[PDB]
Design a protein around this ligand. Sequence first.
Ligand code: SF4
Ligand code: SF4
Ligand code: SF4
Ligand code: SF4
Ligand code: SF4
Ligand code: FES
Lengths: 588, 227, 158, 159
Amino acid sequence: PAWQTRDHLDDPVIGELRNRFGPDAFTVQATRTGVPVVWIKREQLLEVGDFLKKLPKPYVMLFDLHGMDERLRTHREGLPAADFSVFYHLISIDRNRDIMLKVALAENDLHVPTFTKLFPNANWYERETWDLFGITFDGHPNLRRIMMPQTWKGHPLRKDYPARATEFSPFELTKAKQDLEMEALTFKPEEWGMKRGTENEDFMFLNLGPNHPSAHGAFRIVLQLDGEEIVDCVPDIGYHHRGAEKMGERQSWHSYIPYTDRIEYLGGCVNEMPYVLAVEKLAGITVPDRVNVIRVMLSELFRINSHLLYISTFIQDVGAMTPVFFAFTDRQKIYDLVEAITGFRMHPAWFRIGGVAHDLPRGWDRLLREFLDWMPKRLASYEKAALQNTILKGRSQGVAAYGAKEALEWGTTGAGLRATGIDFDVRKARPYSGYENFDFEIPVGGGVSDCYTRVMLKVEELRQSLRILEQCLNNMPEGPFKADHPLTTPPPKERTLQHIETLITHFLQVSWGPVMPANESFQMIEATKGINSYYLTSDGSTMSYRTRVRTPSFAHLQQIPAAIRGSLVSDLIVYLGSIDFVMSDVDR
Amino acid sequence: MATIHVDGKEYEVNGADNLLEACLSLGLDIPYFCWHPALGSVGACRQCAVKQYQNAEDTRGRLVMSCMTPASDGTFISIDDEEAKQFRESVVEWLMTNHPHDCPVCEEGGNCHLQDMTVMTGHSFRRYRFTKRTHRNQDLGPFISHEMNRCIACYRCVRYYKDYADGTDLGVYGAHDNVYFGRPEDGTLESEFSGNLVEICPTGVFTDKTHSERYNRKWDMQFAPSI
Amino acid sequence: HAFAKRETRMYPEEPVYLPPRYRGRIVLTRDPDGEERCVACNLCAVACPVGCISLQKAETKDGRWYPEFFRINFSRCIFCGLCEEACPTTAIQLTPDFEMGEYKRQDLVYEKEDLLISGPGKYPEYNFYRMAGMAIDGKDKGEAENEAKPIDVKSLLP
Amino acid sequence: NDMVNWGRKNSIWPYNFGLSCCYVEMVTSFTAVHLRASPRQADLMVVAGTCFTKMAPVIQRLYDQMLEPKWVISMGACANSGGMYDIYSVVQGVDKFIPVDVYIPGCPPRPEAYMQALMLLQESIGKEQGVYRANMQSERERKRGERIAVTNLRTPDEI
Ligand code: SF4
Ligand code: SF4
Ligand code: SF4
Ligand code: SF4
Ligand code: SF4
Ligand code: FES
């Protein structure tokens, strides 16, 4: 099965590292992540990573870097004695494989050498590890707090830190006056990054925080200006931090599902798919085929809606917005179908562990068929309106372009990375949710990623998604909407209303929570923006022990300073609009 | 004192103990109803079944009851053997054939050992389609309410009340599937230790009447250690 | 004038179309016999992720469980619908009605008289007590679905 | 005469402060009902979205900038209270630090709810905060006999 606990010791990378270093040091954990998890003492981490970086098929992209507390795990059979841990998820595209590296730390000596030299995108990741935990990374260039304000005492992801606001003092405005004094005295100490330029007439400091529309959330990007050039741009993020990861620790597996919908406001059921897939990987549940096709239908509908919003906003900011406002009416039709299936326009919270909340209502096929026959003529009107236009096309060529290597080092996935010559989708490389029974193509941009190429690729992907949605309408099979397994949460409701054992299972599942045995799962999907993943660790209880949400927008927003260096403020704003970043995703 | 082999692994246990309290001492979850640490093992519920092999090379053994088998040195058992798991699920199902549809209106809901063992075995699908047996209740005082429909015939109440507590006014009546646990006639339970039945009974037959005036579920309770 | 003709000015429509499964206002429904359907099982309160439901069980002399008080804090409610699917009696349901707005937050907390409606809502026929073993007026022991008559231990038949 | 009161009911200037989420429905409403909205010119601020501890001074400066007659509409559960995010990093409602006049529950509310918010706000603006000994009547109490008289609803197996 695809859920069984494997060691992955046979994997070639494990044997190459065993040959290179011989025996000892490496303890191969047993998990349901699908990838090989290896423990590597902190004094060899930089050596180990370097070996993997230059291996004859290298791990070019650091997918994720974060930490785990690990202090309260009672079931710790086989692991070394750790009070804290830091995990590094790496991916080799040429091998289409992954590797996870875990460095164990003790509570008195939370110190590890910085990993940013190998992979630059790790810099913010290590900063987050300094912010949310108390690990100090010696050798880090700018190790400051990236989420909480600079006077915030406490490391919020430690388990000795109370999670809920109720345990702290309420908003009595004792600290509001101090924040007011700080904001009124807005001066630059030159500690906000390298800030090599001095604060004088030579260099001008401008917050440049876009609160205008199409900004994709309110954020600040302190900018040093010289000759109207971007000398150094430093984002000030964390304003939209909702503590989703910490929230995952105090909620049951079933009642957390609503929280997934709000990592990305436009994603909806796309955000729910990786969570339910990871929880079912911990449960060992194989769903029926109808569940797979239903999930594919809802995810391609939400993907179509998000892509249409990205196209419309792009044509509005750098082009003529008169015709593309008709897409707003079209988006309403996609919404009337979602609330026909799920119930509510946004944040459906409709996916469940083992299936979906209800069956499809009997008039779904006629509405979907009317939308699928009506849409292609409009889609071709947008294709002519966007492929053939000249004014924005001339404007949108060579505007902060990057190549395959630049995207790889910066962890950038999605339409950004597909705009280069690397043919890498996860729906084909690692099929999930029954994508391997569908026929679709991956468009590609060639070798230059710019603003025109990304939108043309998004239109081609939207056409392939519409082909998937017609295949979902014509090949939806028959049978149940929920798996038959004691951990399917909740049970079918008609069975609950008549049968005592199903009633008892429903009783304990919705009240105490389902008991998932202690193990680790991990799922990644192609999201509306980039690759989104969920790394869940259970300690055997009815709540998550650790929830890690990898959002690509964090990496996409981290990438801007490497590419925008040597451009104007207008090119900056155009690039910010072009890049698929939403503040809710960056700050989770 | 003794060494036992469970599902291939090896453990150190007390020889005088039986296999259920040995395996529960190691943190291995075996379902049970009729065994109690204070009361001892009688072997009634047949819920604690494990597969026992004669040695390490015997692949097909027999289903025994871990509460009734001593944990001697050299014991080879399998809790997770497929036939043992099927049998324990079948026992839960046979207990579920006559259980009333009462969990929303049961005071044991959220604190019921039968709910826990039912989830632990993983029995969630009903096949029994016939009629259910019902019983009338008795009045057992101002302290204890009685709902005999919920009884699973685990015999913990009579073993606690007569043997342990030396009470005289609680017994078992009838035969086959019509066994009735209670008093010969309505009237307050005379024993000074009658209220421990609320913990001793694994279902909601005997429930606290003082708590059912202002009832709330266990997850909504706030607890502290007191004297 | 042709451009204004094809882009006709939008006119708002007083009727609004909602699907049956729309997750708006939270109501408590009644049995087809006319009694309140809620048995104060406290599953909706615990299954809510935000904790917006408070209630207390009461019991009639007849023996019917019913809520002494039922309190929903609609300022915090997100209309996730986990309460509706948690309920094993279909007492609490979500109706297509979003018409809410208030000057004071203290008036957004709804009591049982603001939630208990005069009929059965989405499921006109389901009655939970007909299934339940517990005995109420009109339902002695053996008057439930798929339940045999009580046989006393003193019966002459072996 | 009350001509001054008529002036404010007829015309209002909205300052949209919708945040990351919950603003797509507000935009859906605004593009149907209505570059005019400008800072330090509006008298109505529709706070939507989750109010965070970090960015709360921004909302307090925008609240301070507007003129003496200040109206505030909180929309969504995330703005009325902390909503679902009862967490260290979210302040439990925008009403903690700025006075609020109208509360619109939902997550996100509907454009029709925005329409009913303007109707309840012109109703408050036409009775002079607008209490006036007439606002004790509440929407919980005004339509109570309307809501209780509902008996039948469509079964959810249909569209
Ligand atoms: S006594 Fe236990 S099994 Fe029986 S109805 Fe109550 S909670 Fe369910
Ligand atoms: S009344 Fe309780 S203790 Fe006695 S047999 Fe029945 S379930 Fe067991
Ligand atoms: S789950 Fe339904 S019946 Fe039970 S207390 Fe809640 S609202 Fe009442
Ligand atoms: S709809 Fe959601 S937030 Fe509202 S009471 Fe039900 S579970 Fe709680
Ligand atoms: S009210 Fe709903 S849509 Fe608005 S911010 Fe809160 S969760 Fe998001
Ligand atoms: S509990 Fe061991 S046989 Fe009954």
